[PDB]
Amino acid sequence: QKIGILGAMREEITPILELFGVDFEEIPLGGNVFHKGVYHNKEIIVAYSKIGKVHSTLTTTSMILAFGVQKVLFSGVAGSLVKDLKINDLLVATQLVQHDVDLSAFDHPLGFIPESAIFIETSGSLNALAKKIANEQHIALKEGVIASGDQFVHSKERKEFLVSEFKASAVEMEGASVAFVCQKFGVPCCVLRSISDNADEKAGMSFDEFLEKSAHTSAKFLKSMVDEL
Amino acid sequence: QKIGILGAMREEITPILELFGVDFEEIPLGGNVFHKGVYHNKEIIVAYSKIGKVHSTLTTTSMILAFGVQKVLFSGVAGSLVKDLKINDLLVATQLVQHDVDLSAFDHPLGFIPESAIFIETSGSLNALAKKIANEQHIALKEGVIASGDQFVHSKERKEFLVSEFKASAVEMEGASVAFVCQKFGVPCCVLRSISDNADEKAGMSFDEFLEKSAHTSAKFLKSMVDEL
Ligand SMILES: Nc1ncnc2[nH]cnc12
Ligand SMILES: Nc1ncnc2[nH]cnc12
Hints:
Chain A has 229 residues and is an alpha/beta fold. Chain A has 6 helices and 10 strands; from the N terminus they run βαβββαβββαβαβαβα. The first copy, chain A, has helices spanning 10-20, 53-67, 124-136, 156-166, 175-185, 203-226, and strands at residues 2-7, 25-29, 32-39, 42-48, 71-80, 90-98, 119-121, 141-148, 170-172, 189-197. The A-B interface holds A 30-31, 50-55, 57-58, 61-62, 65-66, 98, 100-106, 113-116, 150-154, 176-177, 180-181, 184-185, 203-204, 207 and B 30-31, 50-55, 57-58, 61-62, 65-66, 98, 100-106, 113-116, 150-154, 176-177, 180-181, 184-185, 203-204, 207. Chains A, B: Pfam families: PNP_UDP_1.
């Protein structure tokens, strides 16, 4: 079995590497470093993509094409758009959208690109596994919509748009693109996020305070999933 | 020699296929169809990515990793931001930026992502070849900055931003991402565009009228470059 494990930032994968605690071979490709290891009879390939849609699309495509991963699990932090997602809370993305896509010049719905779709789906099986683990461990786990775009959201106005247009529960910058690539190649994908901020005027300061802890919370949960695979 | 040739839309590569006039093998991968042919001792791989940064990043990465292309030439249409770029006029991108990238929440310059750069460069050699061909054929060819983003621009306000923030000459939705992937893999890249509209309130109607002709103008020029490779 071969499992790809992705984060966007070094801070998001550092706890992943430490938690698995095995020897990793570092393999450079396409401006990324892939960490290849063996964990309980499974080959794991771990990398951070760097932030945003282009970075994450590239890295996910490399993972699939060059490393032959059979599933991709993403772990990282996100901004909350809903009251019931507090700092540190976990969410699994059931659907994702590229919230900054706009071809309204041609009267297309926002988020829509011709020959594509507004929403991208993730793995029913992996999401179901996540919910079972959360329940067993007495952890709250929201199953909902993630909006992804190439802006770090820090305004009430944009939050209101994401909630009204897309019914999004959280916002980040890589989930939709990772899930998109996985779907195009027929690779099961799960996107996990822990909340670092409220995507408002104070989002940057909140993110700075909570990045480490939220990154660890997500990583620890991802590890618990791999332990059941 | 192996050359990748990319457009974003079917309309942008149809004239490319027709102009080369050779037999193509159709090969599906990652939601794209790659057209593989032989033209004067060179293997050419032609595809359209579909619109936008995620689509084009995926396709370019597939071209490089799965097909082993040694250079990538992009051809398509774009919106003009400058008076001296009229409908049908050609531009080669010397530098490109992702104009919709915004991490100002952390006081980063617009267009900047940590561990990256605002501007992406293209092939000095290919751009120089393009200028020589244009000169020899009495064709105007601007060498300038392209701004790429996941919105089809159709407002004076956004045009003013692109010109002031990035000194952009044209706007489109794939150039920066294609060039970005090529640079990460050390693959020479040239991005060619023909103007279809003025990126203003009437951009959609202009695009509809001029897509076919502008797409052909770009394709014909791209072919003339390949004829010198
Ligand atoms: N507010 C926010 N916007 C985008 N990505 C984020 N990741 C964490 N917080 C975020
Ligand atoms: N106005 C515009 N905005 C973005 N991409 C374009 N391609 C052609 N015209 C465009």
